[PDB]
């Protein structure tokens, strides 16, 4: 477990996790707010 956790603690794996997290957040924001351009509350 802890060896696999340290493998998951390596830089490419946590970078991949950040990549999926940020991409999914931005994609869901764009999907539920279709095409915004100007901040208007």
């Amino acid at each position: 477990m802890k060896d696999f956790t340290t493998y998951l603690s390596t830089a490419p794996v946590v970078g991949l996790g950040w990549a999926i997290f940020t991409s999914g957040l931005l994609i869901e924001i764009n999907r539920f707010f279709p095409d915004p351009l100007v901040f208007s509350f």
Partner: protein
Amino acid sequence: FKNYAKAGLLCGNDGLPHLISDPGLALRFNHAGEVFIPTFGFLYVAGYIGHVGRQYIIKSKEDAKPTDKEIILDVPLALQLAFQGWAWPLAAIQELRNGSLLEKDENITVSPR
């Protein structure tokens, strides 16, 4: 197309909306939400990134083999610093006030003239 209208957006001679970047002019014509508010928000997020990275750089150096912590990230420590960066400008200006934000020119690696 409905949301781009009735929101202060204006277009010139082609129907493609234009954005006003000068503050003050955007403030007195309700164009601040075009770039003025997003630029402040991006500055806030970029300062969040910089403060989190600075905290991880400083907090992972007082230990044996800091490069090992750089290459294999301390995930609980990284998440703790991630959730502690919500007040990045306060800590940044306080580090500026106490002088720990900047290093003196005597301890800084410098190229020969």
